[PDB]
């Protein structure tokens with residue numbers, strides 16, 4: 001079986017700033033708190049690019065290997081798929097897109113992030129959804145914190 005879900009985050013920063021962070025397939029650690037390092041060979045932002053991701057020390061896994069499936073700089077879509085690593089996420093893939101919006105009369109960014117993953121042996125579908133959703137929520141919360149802080153720092 002699989003878990004498939006979508007999470008939404010409202011970010012109080014302009015799209016061009018948020019996208020400049022999200023699009024860096026080679027630097028996920030800039031806002032994903034559980035990631036330490038990341039290396040991409042060749043043209044780092046091309047479809048088919050492979051990133052080797054180092055997780056922070058003290059986790060059950062240590063590394064993930066992930067492929068760039070989509071990078072659309074016009075419509076602000078990033079799609080990735082995990083293809084290796086010493087974790088238990090099999091057939092994980094995700095898409096995040098960003099969209100301009102207006103909340104409280106000010107320009108901001110809507111992030112929509114969807115995933116599909118297999119339910120691993122030994123876990124329930126509910127546990128699998130909860131695990132991935134909590135981590136994506138942590139990442140989207142961190143993306144908002146990072147970009148809203150960059151926004152504040154840029155203002156006079």
Ligand SMILES: O=C(Cc1cc(C2CC2)c(-n2cc(CNC(=O)c3cnc4ccccc4n3)nn2)c(C2CC2)c1)NC1(C(=O)O)CCCCC1
Nearest residue numbers: 032034059060061063064087088089120123127128131135
């Ligand atoms: O943010 C991250 C970083 C990231 C990436 C990874 C693994 C390399 C992929 C991990 N990890 C995972 C593990 C070991 N447990 C599993 O494998 C795993 C798989 N089924 C489960 C199903 C139910 C309950 C627990 C489960 N447990 N040890 N470390 C973490 C740790 C947990 C905080 C963070 N990853 C995502 C991203 O958006 O980049 C968001 C979350 C989904 C994957 C993509």
